[PDB]
Amino acid sequence: AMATLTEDDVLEQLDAQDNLFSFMKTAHSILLQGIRQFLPSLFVDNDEEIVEYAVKPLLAQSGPLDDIDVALRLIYALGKMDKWLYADITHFSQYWHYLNEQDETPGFADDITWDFISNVNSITRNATLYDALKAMKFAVWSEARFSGMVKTALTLAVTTTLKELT
Amino acid sequence: AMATLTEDDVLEQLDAQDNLFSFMKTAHSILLQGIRQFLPSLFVDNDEEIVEYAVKPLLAQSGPLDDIDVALRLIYALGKMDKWLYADITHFSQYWHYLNEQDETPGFADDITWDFISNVNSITRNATLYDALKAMKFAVWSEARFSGMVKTALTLAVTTTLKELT
C-alpha cells in the first residue's frame, strides 16, 4: 500500500523506468493504488459505525478488495465506471499478468506492445498522439525515439486513467 | 451454494435440527445463502457487459463475496442495511464461529445462549415472544418446553432476518 498520488511523482516514477517490464510493474502498482484510493467513494461516508467496522476491514491491506481485478469489477458493477475506462485498466492488468507470468522480454517497440497500445482507449482516442505514433512507426527512423514516444503514450494512459479516478 | 429460499422449507430445515450446534450450523448456511441471494440487488441490472464480466465473478462460489462477513460488510458499507439487522446477523455469525471454533457443547437452554438471544434484536423487539420467554425462563417448569421455545424464537430471528433481505 502506497502514499498518495500526485501527477508529478507518478510521472517521476514512470520516467525512471527504462524497460517495458519495469514500467508495467510500476504502472500496475500505481493503478492499484489509484483504484484503492477511489474505493472509499463507493461507500457510506458520514456514519462511524459503518466506517470503522464495515469499510475499514473491506479496504484493509491483503483484504478482499486489495486486488486490482476484484476492485475494478466492484466499481464497474456498482455503475461507477464507464466501459472505456474499465477496458483500459483491465488491459493494463492483463498485460502486466502477461509480462509477469508468461513473458517479460517484450520492449516498448515490439509488435506485441504496439497491439496493446492500439487497444488502450486513452491512447487511441487522443488523435494527434496516436497519429504521431503511427507516423513515427511507419516512416530511416530511430528505435530509441519511437521507444521513448511509446513510453510517453503509456505514461499518458496511466496519468489520464488516474485523473478519471478522483 | 444452495437452491432458493422459501419460508417453509427453511422452517423444515430448522425444525429438523435437534441441538443448538446443528441448528446454528444450519442457520449459518441459511443466512449465508439469504445474503448471497440479495447481493445482485447491489449492482447493475440492465447492462450485460457488467453482469457477465463484473457481477458474476464477484458472486461466483468461493469468490470474494462468498463469505458472510465480507458480504455483510459490503451491504452495510453501501448503506443498504439498517444497523439493527447488521447487528443481528453478525451475532449469529459470531455465535456460529464461537460454536464451531471454540465450543459446540452449549444447548438451547444454556446461560451462554440466553445471553445470545438477549442481544438478538428481532427476538427482543417482539415484546410478547420475549416476555413469554422470560416468564418461561423464570417460573416447577420444564427444560424441554423452554428449549423448544428457545428454538422457536431463534427460528423466528432467522425467518424475520430472511424476510428483510427480499
UniProtKB/Swiss-Prot annotation, chains A, B:
Q: Which domain of life is it from?
A: Bacteria
Q: What class of enzyme is it?
A: lyase
Q: Name one GO molecular function term.
A: fumarate hydratase activity
Q: Which reaction(s) does its UniProt entry say it catalyses?
A: (S)-malate = fumarate + H2O
SUPFAM superfamilies reported for this sequence:
MtlR-like
Gene3D superfamilies assigned = Nucleotidyltransferases domain 2
**Entry-linked PANTHER family:** FUMARASE E-RELATED (PTHR37941:SF1)
Q: Which family does it belong to?
A: Belongs to the MtlR/FumE family.
Role: In vitro catalyzes the addition of water to fumarate, forming malate. Cannot catalyze the reverse reaction. Cannot use the cis-isomer maleate as substrate.
The protein here is known as Fumarase E
Organism from which the protein derives: Shigella flexneri
